[PDB]
Every structure is written in C-alpha cells, then in structure tokens.
C-alpha cells in the first residue's frame, strides 16, 4: 500500500519537475508516469505546450494549502538523484491533472513503479477524445 507524506514547495522547475523540502532537505522530484513538453530540453530547449504545462504545474502547486508526495513500490530515485513520486496538491494528483488536460502523455512505464498507470491511461484516453492541447 502507498502512503502520502507532506512536503513543502521550494520551486517549480518545469511541467514535470519540482524542488520540494522533504523530510527537512531540499530535493528535486520528477513526476512519475508522465512526460510533459519541455522548456529546458538538452537539444530543442522550448517545445510546444511546454510553457503551458509548466505554468499549469506551477499554479497548481503554488496555490495549494497542502502538498503531499507519494512514492510508488519500486526505486524512489532516478539516476540523476531525483525523487520519483506522485504529487498531490490539496488531495488532487498533479500527474493526473496534467494528463487529463492534454498537457502530458503517459510515459514509458517501468514496473514495479506503475501503480497508477491504468488510472492515468484512462485520463489520457479522455483528453485524446476531447482533443485537448497536445491532442488538438
């Protein structure tokens, strides 16, 4: 069973990356199971819907009363030292919110970190059907 722990925002970096204070330390978190268009791409730098995905994540986390992080059942850090988590703003999953608005695709999934994969894919299927943003 997954559980939520509190965290405090330090800074939103991108649509899918955030700096948070977690168990008293600054740490970078990457949102599990989602890919957002980048504003900080090695190669291309700024891609389409990049600034929109980024502003949507930032507003959601900046205006929340409570942020929580939920680790999955697999590895909790990627090879860059970023935490791999589902982030919740006032009880609403930010990973899902993005996918539901057509501002993120469901990523390539690495078992065992795939607990919310079906739920995310259902939201993605709805944003495609509605032709939102990325899907327009």
PDB file of C-alpha atoms in Angstrom:
ATOM      1  CA  UNK A   1       0.000   0.000   0.000  1.00  0.00           C
ATOM      2  CA  UNK A   2       1.303   3.528  -0.932  1.00  0.00           C
ATOM      3  CA  UNK A   3       1.061   6.377   1.588  1.00  0.00           C
ATOM      4  CA  UNK A   4       1.316  10.212   1.322  1.00  0.00           C
ATOM      5  CA  UNK A   5       3.865  12.299   3.199  1.00  0.00           C
ATOM      6  CA  UNK A   6       3.979  16.094   3.444  1.00  0.00           C
ATOM      7  CA  UNK A   7       6.328  18.261   1.545  1.00  0.00           C
ATOM      8  CA  UNK A   8       6.757  21.981   1.110  1.00  0.00           C
ATOM      9  CA  UNK A   9       7.324  23.672  -2.257  1.00  0.00           C
ATOM     10  CA  UNK A  10      10.666  25.284  -2.869  1.00  0.00           C
ATOM     11  CA  UNK A  11      10.374  25.955  -6.604  1.00  0.00           C
ATOM     12  CA  UNK A  12       8.560  24.602  -9.689  1.00  0.00           C
ATOM     13  CA  UNK A  13      11.256  23.989 -12.318  1.00  0.00           C
ATOM     14  CA  UNK A  14       9.279  22.607 -15.219  1.00  0.00           C
ATOM     15  CA  UNK A  15       5.962  20.936 -16.107  1.00  0.00           C
ATOM     16  CA  UNK A  16       7.245  17.701 -14.598  1.00  0.00           C
ATOM     17  CA  UNK A  17       9.976  18.616 -12.174  1.00  0.00           C
ATOM     18  CA  UNK A  18       9.755  20.336  -8.874  1.00  0.00           C
ATOM     19  CA  UNK A  19      12.074  21.244  -5.985  1.00  0.00           C
ATOM     20  CA  UNK A  20      10.494  20.422  -2.621  1.00  0.00           C
ATOM     21  CA  UNK A  21      11.559  20.298   1.064  1.00  0.00           C
ATOM     22  CA  UNK A  22      11.077  16.726   2.019  1.00  0.00           C
ATOM     23  CA  UNK A  23      11.898  15.239   5.470  1.00  0.00           C
ATOM     24  CA  UNK A  24      13.764  18.512   6.080  1.00  0.00           C
ATOM     25  CA  UNK A  25      16.090  18.526   2.964  1.00  0.00           C
ATOM     26  CA  UNK A  26      15.750  20.294  -0.447  1.00  0.00           C
ATOM     27  CA  UNK A  27      15.196  17.552  -3.006  1.00  0.00           C
ATOM     28  CA  UNK A  28      14.291  17.572  -6.799  1.00  0.00           C
ATOM     29  CA  UNK A  29      11.257  15.427  -7.688  1.00  0.00           C
ATOM     30  CA  UNK A  30      10.280  14.154 -11.068  1.00  0.00           C
ATOM     31  CA  UNK A  31       6.569  13.304 -11.575  1.00  0.00           C
ATOM     32  CA  UNK A  32       6.032   9.577 -12.114  1.00  0.00           C
ATOM     33  CA  UNK A  33       4.473   8.181 -15.324  1.00  0.00           C
ATOM     34  CA  UNK A  34       4.088  11.416 -17.173  1.00  0.00           C
ATOM     35  CA  UNK A  35       6.031  13.277 -19.889  1.00  0.00           C
ATOM     36  CA  UNK A  36       5.347  16.993 -20.363  1.00  0.00           C
ATOM     37  CA  UNK A  37       6.724  19.030 -23.230  1.00  0.00           C
ATOM     38  CA  UNK A  38       9.992  20.624 -22.083  1.00  0.00           C
ATOM     39  CA  UNK A  39      11.046  24.264 -21.728  1.00  0.00           C
ATOM     40  CA  UNK A  40      14.560  23.033 -20.710  1.00  0.00           C
ATOM     41  CA  UNK A  41      15.323  20.490 -23.459  1.00  0.00           C
ATOM     42  CA  UNK A  42      19.022  19.488 -23.910  1.00  0.00           C
ATOM     43  CA  UNK A  43      18.587  19.788 -27.672  1.00  0.00           C
ATOM     44  CA  UNK A  44      15.421  21.759 -28.576  1.00  0.00           C
ATOM     45  CA  UNK A  45      15.106  23.907 -25.421  1.00  0.00           C
ATOM     46  CA  UNK A  46      11.395  25.003 -25.674  1.00  0.00           C
ATOM     47  CA  UNK A  47       8.759  22.719 -27.244  1.00  0.00           C
ATOM     48  CA  UNK A  48       5.014  23.209 -27.971  1.00  0.00           C
ATOM     49  CA  UNK A  49       2.724  23.309 -24.875  1.00  0.00           C
ATOM     50  CA  UNK A  50       5.996  23.401 -22.864  1.00  0.00           C
ATOM     51  CA  UNK A  51       5.287  26.810 -21.273  1.00  0.00           C
ATOM     52  CA  UNK A  52       1.606  25.878 -20.736  1.00  0.00           C
ATOM     53  CA  UNK A  53       2.377  22.530 -18.965  1.00  0.00           C
ATOM     54  CA  UNK A  54       4.937  24.407 -16.938  1.00  0.00           C
ATOM     55  CA  UNK A  55       2.530  27.216 -15.914  1.00  0.00           C
ATOM     56  CA  UNK A  56      -0.205  24.684 -15.086  1.00  0.00           C
ATOM     57  CA  UNK A  57       2.025  22.655 -12.713  1.00  0.00           C
ATOM     58  CA  UNK A  58       3.395  25.881 -11.083  1.00  0.00           C
ATOM     59  CA  UNK A  59      -0.098  27.408 -10.465  1.00  0.00           C
ATOM     60  CA  UNK A  60      -1.380  24.126  -9.110  1.00  0.00           C
ATOM     61  CA  UNK A  61       1.439  23.701  -6.618  1.00  0.00           C
ATOM     62  CA  UNK A  62       1.881  27.396  -5.666  1.00  0.00           C
ATOM     63  CA  UNK A  63      -1.761  27.875  -4.785  1.00  0.00           C
ATOM     64  CA  UNK A  64      -2.241  24.677  -2.797  1.00  0.00           C
ATOM     65  CA  UNK A  65      -2.712  24.692   1.032  1.00  0.00           C
ATOM     66  CA  UNK A  66      -1.187  21.218   1.337  1.00  0.00           C
ATOM     67  CA  UNK A  67       1.383  19.268  -0.884  1.00  0.00           C
ATOM     68  CA  UNK A  68       1.958  15.592  -0.458  1.00  0.00           C
ATOM     69  CA  UNK A  69       4.350  13.146  -2.114  1.00  0.00           C
ATOM     70  CA  UNK A  70       3.528   9.536  -2.660  1.00  0.00           C
ATOM     71  CA  UNK A  71       6.325   7.096  -3.644  1.00  0.00           C
ATOM     72  CA  UNK A  72       5.487   4.016  -5.739  1.00  0.00           C
ATOM     73  CA  UNK A  73       6.603   0.424  -4.856  1.00  0.00           C
ATOM     74  CA  UNK A  74       9.859   0.430  -6.871  1.00  0.00           C
ATOM     75  CA  UNK A  75      13.002   2.581  -6.917  1.00  0.00           C
ATOM     76  CA  UNK A  76      12.344   6.006  -5.321  1.00  0.00           C
ATOM     77  CA  UNK A  77      15.161   7.959  -7.053  1.00  0.00           C
ATOM     78  CA  UNK A  78      16.245   8.010 -10.676  1.00  0.00           C
ATOM     79  CA  UNK A  79      19.920   8.037 -11.825  1.00  0.00           C
ATOM     80  CA  UNK A  80      20.023  11.871 -11.559  1.00  0.00           C
ATOM     81  CA  UNK A  81      19.092  11.774  -7.870  1.00  0.00           C
ATOM     82  CA  UNK A  82      15.525  12.992  -8.450  1.00  0.00           C
ATOM     83  CA  UNK A  83      12.680  11.532  -6.284  1.00  0.00           C
ATOM     84  CA  UNK A  84      10.094   9.583  -8.371  1.00  0.00           C
ATOM     85  CA  UNK A  85       6.650  10.332  -6.943  1.00  0.00           C
ATOM     86  CA  UNK A  86       3.017  11.150  -7.461  1.00  0.00           C
ATOM     87  CA  UNK A  87       2.446  14.660  -6.137  1.00  0.00           C
ATOM     88  CA  UNK A  88      -0.858  15.770  -4.717  1.00  0.00           C
ATOM     89  CA  UNK A  89      -1.984  19.411  -4.290  1.00  0.00           C
ATOM     90  CA  UNK A  90      -4.951  19.632  -1.925  1.00  0.00           C
ATOM     91  CA  UNK A  91      -5.736  15.992  -2.468  1.00  0.00           C
ATOM     92  CA  UNK A  92      -5.674  16.276  -6.321  1.00  0.00           C
ATOM     93  CA  UNK A  93      -2.937  14.320  -8.171  1.00  0.00           C
ATOM     94  CA  UNK A  94      -0.890  16.756 -10.232  1.00  0.00           C
ATOM     95  CA  UNK A  95       0.360  13.898 -12.514  1.00  0.00           C
ATOM     96  CA  UNK A  96      -3.259  13.082 -13.400  1.00  0.00           C
ATOM     97  CA  UNK A  97      -4.370  16.682 -13.730  1.00  0.00           C
ATOM     98  CA  UNK A  98      -1.747  17.252 -16.426  1.00  0.00           C
ATOM     99  CA  UNK A  99      -2.677  14.169 -18.427  1.00  0.00           C
ATOM    100  CA  UNK A 100      -6.395  14.992 -18.075  1.00  0.00           C
ATOM    101  CA  UNK A 101      -5.790  18.458 -19.657  1.00  0.00           C
ATOM    102  CA  UNK A 102      -3.863  17.073 -22.592  1.00  0.00           C
ATOM    103  CA  UNK A 103      -0.650  18.684 -21.228  1.00  0.00           C
ATOM    104  CA  UNK A 104       1.286  15.448 -20.619  1.00  0.00           C
ATOM    105  CA  UNK A 105       1.487  11.975 -22.186  1.00  0.00           C
ATOM    106  CA  UNK A 106       1.599   8.800 -20.084  1.00  0.00           C
ATOM    107  CA  UNK A 107       5.363   7.849 -20.052  1.00  0.00           C
ATOM    108  CA  UNK A 108       7.008   4.543 -20.791  1.00  0.00           C
ATOM    109  CA  UNK A 109       6.236   2.558 -17.670  1.00  0.00           C
ATOM    110  CA  UNK A 110       8.846   0.703 -15.636  1.00  0.00           C
ATOM    111  CA  UNK A 111       7.382  -2.000 -13.430  1.00  0.00           C
ATOM    112  CA  UNK A 112       7.113  -2.044 -10.443  1.00  0.00           C
ATOM    113  CA  UNK A 113       6.521   1.782 -10.498  1.00  0.00           C
ATOM    114  CA  UNK A 114       3.200   1.552 -12.272  1.00  0.00           C
ATOM    115  CA  UNK A 115       0.625   1.601  -9.517  1.00  0.00           C
ATOM    116  CA  UNK A 116      -1.484   4.488 -11.031  1.00  0.00           C
ATOM    117  CA  UNK A 117      -0.828   3.550 -14.687  1.00  0.00           C
ATOM    118  CA  UNK A 118      -4.408   2.419 -15.572  1.00  0.00           C
ATOM    119  CA  UNK A 119      -5.984   5.484 -13.964  1.00  0.00           C
ATOM    120  CA  UNK A 120      -3.608   7.786 -15.844  1.00  0.00           C
ATOM    121  CA  UNK A 121      -4.151   5.978 -19.156  1.00  0.00           C
ATOM    122  CA  UNK A 122      -7.948   6.416 -18.689  1.00  0.00           C
ATOM    123  CA  UNK A 123      -7.493  10.204 -18.247  1.00  0.00           C
ATOM    124  CA  UNK A 124      -5.196  10.294 -21.279  1.00  0.00           C
ATOM    125  CA  UNK A 125      -7.832   8.469 -23.384  1.00  0.00           C
ATOM    126  CA  UNK A 126     -10.395  11.184 -22.271  1.00  0.00           C
ATOM    127  CA  UNK A 127      -8.100  14.076 -23.205  1.00  0.00           C
ATOM    128  CA  UNK A 128      -7.475  12.472 -26.646  1.00  0.00           C
ATOM    129  CA  UNK A 129     -11.266  12.001 -27.178  1.00  0.00           C
ATOM    130  CA  UNK A 130     -11.766  15.621 -26.202  1.00  0.00           C
ATOM    131  CA  UNK A 131      -8.817  16.663 -28.391  1.00  0.00           C
ATOM    132  CA  UNK A 132      -7.250  18.884 -25.779  1.00  0.00           C
ATOM    133  CA  UNK A 133      -3.974  20.802 -26.150  1.00  0.00           C
ATOM    134  CA  UNK A 134      -1.356  18.133 -27.142  1.00  0.00           C
ATOM    135  CA  UNK A 135      -4.197  16.181 -28.772  1.00  0.00           C
ATOM    136  CA  UNK A 136      -5.667  19.022 -30.882  1.00  0.00           C
TER     137      UNK A 136
END
